[PDB]
Ligand binder design. Structure first.
Ligand SMILES: *[C@@H]1O[C@H](CO)[C@@H](O[C@@H]2O[C@H](CO)[C@@H](O[C@@H]3O[C@H](CO[C@H]4O[C@H](CO)[C@@H](O)[C@H](O[C@H]5O[C@H](CO)[C@@H](O)[C@H](O)[C@@H]5O[C@H]5O[C@H](CO)[C@@H](O)[C@H](O)[C@@H]5O)[C@@H]4O)[C@@H](O)[C@H](O[C@H]4O[C@H](CO)[C@@H](O)[C@H](O)[C@@H]4O[C@H]4O[C@H](CO)[C@@H](O)[C@H](O)[C@@H]4O)[C@@H]3O)[C@H](O)[C@H]2NC(C)=O)[C@H](O)[C@H]1NC(C)=O
Ligand SMILES: NS(=O)(=O)c1ccc(C(=O)N2C[C@H]3CN(C(=O)c4cc(OCC5CCOCC5)nc(C5CC5)c4)C[C@@H]3C2)nc1
Ligand SMILES: [Ca+2]
Ligand SMILES: [Ca+2]
Ligand SMILES: [Cl-]
Ligand SMILES: [K+]
Ligand code: NA
Ligand SMILES: [Zn+2]
Length: 805
């Protein structure tokens, strides 16, 4: 019930929500069916339109007008945005030359520069260049302020998951808004675009920016606008709020535009009909900037222009139907479109088998335009698994396509020519970022970055402490003139042991053998220095990684590589080696094919054994430092140490061997040397975080050797590729991956072919940030470089995407 008999007089767009069954006058009342009887008359005035004209200048205040051109309007805070231009000979903001804003220039009583966040739905990154002729106001913010060439959204690249990521700094799996449509099995309740359930607070996790501000005593303007309130009125309301007394005035504001998304769905991202929506957005920006100028706030406010995702060409005839693959199509519920999520229609049917559904959807048609996954097998860069609302079965849909259950679903529900929601690496899904104001830099381009980073920067702009989030605080310091956040490196928790020779060969009973028994103070004093770390400056270029949790481990030195060996997991946590442009690839000689050698620095009790691998019919082994890259025949024996061995499925050994024999050398030739750090990852609970030992679900049969879920590599070189990787004076360049350690290659449909036709494509799909690997290992990399820490934080958030320009 709402007793809608109260009045909105003097309450229009009130800042605190009054509780039912009393009537509301706030910018959300319409959406709740709750506005007072007189809300439209008083609060949504339209008379005479939105602009002053010559004859309106100096007029007698008619309180019925939408905006005013009377003499008292400035002090009332309610002039039309063009008032001073038409009536007082002033220029539009866009016509003025840009001039650096070195300090905030604010009216008296302003305690901090206000923040205004202007969000645009479906604003694809290439609109900045392709629509530049019809967006003069946006182009001025962009060229005079700080901009990126694009900003990467989160997966799925849908509206509500991305808006809430912008608000919280969290991945959708953590904030809980995992799609535009959801079922929560604990609640037994459904979330939908249309309807009431979405308003229930239990859906929305984390702590959004308006809540962070309020808790810390910074006043926030209500972020959300009922759809029927026109754009011109939203702008005027913001400008009116900015005229409130010091004690009542908010410090943070939000404007949201449904365009250009609304038209892009109808006409496609570049339809001729798209020019007009772009013009109209620019005009809205013009009205805001003219309005701030009137209030002498145009050199005081920080303005962010940001999108949620882009838009791709997608039509009805590019739909794959699950009815062309599955016979039992009626026993399933599909969440459809630019991604797929599958679960059982009924929890009482015990004949539903996910295993057979996956197999029926796997590599079935030569052109197949989607790929099925168990959620824990999706590329770790998507961070899309750790939530009960995300179904076990997921379909990654090719760009330009849809998935549906049956043909009837499409024709009984072509309309659309655009859509979005695809893999967040896809060029058409990228969106925009511009920052303009006293706190942002002047005329500065910054590299592409992820939208998860922005919550921290918005907190910095408002002097707030961010709630815990998935940004890396300090990685966007390079966007700001001041208010930077001075992060410090995390403290190392465990220090390494440095073992010397402590065990005799005959103390080991590992069931391993090696053909190595062949017998000079020249090459004996030589091998000693190499085991004490004489070549360590060559192979460990950025310091040793720090271990950020409590554990027992050893540093092991060798001629060609260095490792941090875990006595708990019985394998390295990390292995570091450098391969110069000049380096030579050699084979594993015949007599050394099955060679595994005890390491006399490490006890039998803390070593793997070859017997477990013989008895384990499913599991084989590989090496972290590759024997193919040994510097000499004698150095090659180090690569066969039991302390360099890791468990590998035969199917995965195909991937790993191709990477190590062919790809490392290729990257070293292309990048002028590479430094490589490789290692295992254990994420059995798919939370993106390092497992403790009691979380491991699988061991090599009849042993305590734990099986990794993934293997990583971090591949670093000099950004100035005229310098070799091991003598680099300046910025660094990185690419990394987190490969799933799977007993089959069902993921790659072309895997019966030679590795040269499919392995590199798999690696690219599983590209990763250094920061992703840090979360998954409890390690901290790049501890000792000559670069500033903020620059290193930016490097650790970099993702190599493998999309064209
Ligand atoms: C990205 O950033 C985020 C934010 O920093 C990272 O997520 C954090 O990670 C922590 C570790 O996983 C986690 O800490 C746990 O908190 C538990 C209490 O959590 C509540 O309180 C916070 C603070 O107000 C709140 O934010 C939480 O909100 C979650 O849950 C509600 C629903 O209830 C949702 O609305 C919301 O969206 C959010 O859901 C997400 O997180 C949960 C996990 O909390 C997931 O299950 C969801 O899928 C979803 O992703 C909560 O309301 C606390 O109980 C935990 O402590 C247990 O574990 C420790 C081990 O140290 C043990 O000592 C304790 O005894 C305890 O164990 C007991 O419970 C077990 C399970 O019942 C049981 O097995 C044991 O036997 C014990 O009885 C733990 O400290 C933190 O909550 C989240 N925060 C958020 C916002 O998600 C995220 O890791 C980052 N991602 C990456 C890749 O870096
Ligand atoms: N076809 S489609 O693409 O699915 C599609 C479907 C429907 C629509 C649509 O018309 N509506 C009506 C819009 C009003 N609305 C908001 O007011 C709003 C602003 C905001 O802003 C959050 C800020 C964003 C900038 O950064 C700080 C947070 N956050 C939230 C939520 C996260 C808490 C909501 C978004 C609503 C989607 N558009 C596209
Ligand atoms: Ca959207
Ligand atoms: Ca884990
Ligand atoms: Cl969805
Ligand atoms: K085996
Ligand atoms: Na295959
Ligand atoms: Zn949309």
């Amino acid at each position: 019930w709402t007793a809608t008999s109260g009045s909105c007089k003097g309450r229009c767009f009130e800042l605190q929500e009054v509780g039912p069954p009393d009537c509301r006058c706030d910018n959300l009342c319409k959406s709740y069916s709750s506005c007072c009887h007189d809300f439209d008359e008083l609060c949504l005035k339209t008379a005479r339109g939105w602009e002053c004209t010559k004859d309106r200048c100096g007029e007698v205040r008619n309180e019925e007008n939408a905006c005013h051109c009377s003499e008292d309007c400035l002090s009332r805070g309610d002039c039309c945005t063009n008032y001073q231009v038409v009536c007082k000979g002033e220029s539009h903001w866009v016509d003025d030359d840009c001039e650096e804003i070195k300090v905030p220039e604010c009216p008296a009583g302003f305690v901090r520069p206000p923040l205004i966040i202007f969000s645009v739905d479906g604003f694809r990154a290439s609109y900045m260049k392709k629509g530049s002729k019809v967006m003069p106001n946006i182009e001025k913010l962009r060229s005079c302020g700080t901009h990126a060439p694009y900003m990467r959204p989160v997966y799925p690249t849908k509206t509500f998951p991305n808006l809430y990521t912008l608000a919280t700094g969290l991945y959708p799996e953590s904030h809980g808004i995992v799609g535009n449509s959801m079922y929560d099995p604990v609640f037994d309740a459904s979330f939908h675009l249309r309807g009431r359930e979405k308003f229930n607070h239990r859906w929305w996790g984390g702590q959004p920016l308006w809540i962070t501000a309020t808790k810390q005593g910074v006043r926030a303007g209500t972020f959300f606008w009922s759809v029927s309130i026109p754009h011109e009125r939203r702008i005027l309301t913001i400008l009116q709020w900015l005229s409130l007394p010091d004690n009542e005035r908010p410090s943070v504001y939000a404007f949201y535009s449904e365009q250009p998304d609304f038209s892009g769905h109808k006409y496609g991202p570049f339809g001729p009909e798209m020019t007009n929506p772009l013009r109209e957005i620019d005009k809205t920006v013009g009205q805001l900037m003219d309005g701030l100028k009137q209030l002498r706030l145009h050199r005081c406010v920080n303005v962010i222009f940001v999108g949620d995702h882009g838009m791709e060409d997608v039509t009805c005839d590019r739909t794959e139907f699950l009815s062309n693959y599955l016979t039992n199509v009626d026993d399933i519920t599909l969440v459809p479109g630019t991604l797929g999520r599958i679960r059982a229609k009924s929890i009482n049917n015990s004949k539903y088998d996910p295993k057979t559904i996956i197999a029926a959807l796997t590599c079935k048609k030569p052109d197949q335009h989607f790929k099925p996954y168990m959620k824990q097998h999706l590329p770790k860069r998507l961070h899309y698994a750790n939530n009960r609302r995300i179904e076990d079965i997921h379909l990654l849909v090719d760009r330009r396509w849809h998935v549906a259950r049956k043909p009837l679903d499409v024709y009984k529900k072509c309309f659309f020519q655009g859509d979005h929601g695809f893999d967040n690496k896809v060029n058409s899904m990228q969106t925009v970022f511009v920052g303009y104001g006293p706190t942002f830099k002047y005329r500065t381009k910054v590299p592409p970055f992820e939208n998860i980073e922005l919550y921290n920067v918005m907190c910095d702009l408002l002097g707030l402490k961010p709630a815990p989030n998935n940004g890396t605080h300090g990685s966007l310091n390079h966007l700001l003139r001041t208010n930077t956040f001075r992060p410090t490196m995390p403290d190392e928790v465990s220090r390494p042991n440095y073992p010397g020779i402590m065990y005799l060969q005959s103390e080991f009973d590992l069931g391993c053998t090696c053909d190595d028994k062949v017998e000079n103070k020249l090459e004996e004093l030589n091998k000693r220095l190499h085991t004490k770390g004489s070549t360590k400056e060559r192979h460990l270029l950025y310091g040793r990684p720090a271990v950020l949790y409590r554990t027992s481990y050893d540093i092991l030195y060798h001629t060609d590589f260095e490792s941090g060996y875990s006595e708990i997991f019985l394998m390295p946590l990390w292995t570091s080696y450098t391969i110069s442009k000049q380096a030579e690839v050699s084979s594993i000689p015949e007599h050394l094919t099955n060679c595994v050698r005890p390491d006399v620095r490490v006890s039998p009790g803390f070593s793997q054994n070859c017997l477990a691998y013989k008895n384990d019919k499913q599991m084989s082994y590989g090496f972290l430092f590759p024997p193919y890259l040994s510097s000499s025949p004698e150095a090659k024996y180090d690569a066969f140490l039991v302390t360099n061995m890791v468990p590998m499925y035969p199917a995965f050994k195909r991937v790993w061997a191709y990477f190590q024999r062919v790809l490392v050398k290729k990257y070293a030739s292309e990048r002028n040397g590479v430094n490589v750090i490789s290692g295992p990852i254990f994420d059995y609970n798919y939370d993106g975080l390092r497992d403790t030992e009691d979380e491991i679900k699988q061991y090599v049969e009849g042993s305590s050797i734990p099986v990794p879920t993934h293997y990583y590599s971090i591949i670093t070189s000099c950004l100035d590729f005229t310098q070799p990787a091991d003598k680099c004076d300046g910025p660094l360049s990185v690419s990394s991956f987190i490969l799933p350690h799977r007993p089959d290659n069902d993921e790659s449909c072309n895997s019966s072919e030679d590795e040269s036709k499919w392995v590199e494509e798999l690696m690219k799909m599983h590209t990763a940030r250094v920061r992703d690997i840090e979360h998954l290992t409890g390690l901290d990399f790049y501890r000792k470089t000559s670069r500033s820490y903020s620059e290193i934080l930016t490097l650790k958030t970099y993702l190599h995407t493998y999309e064209s320009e």
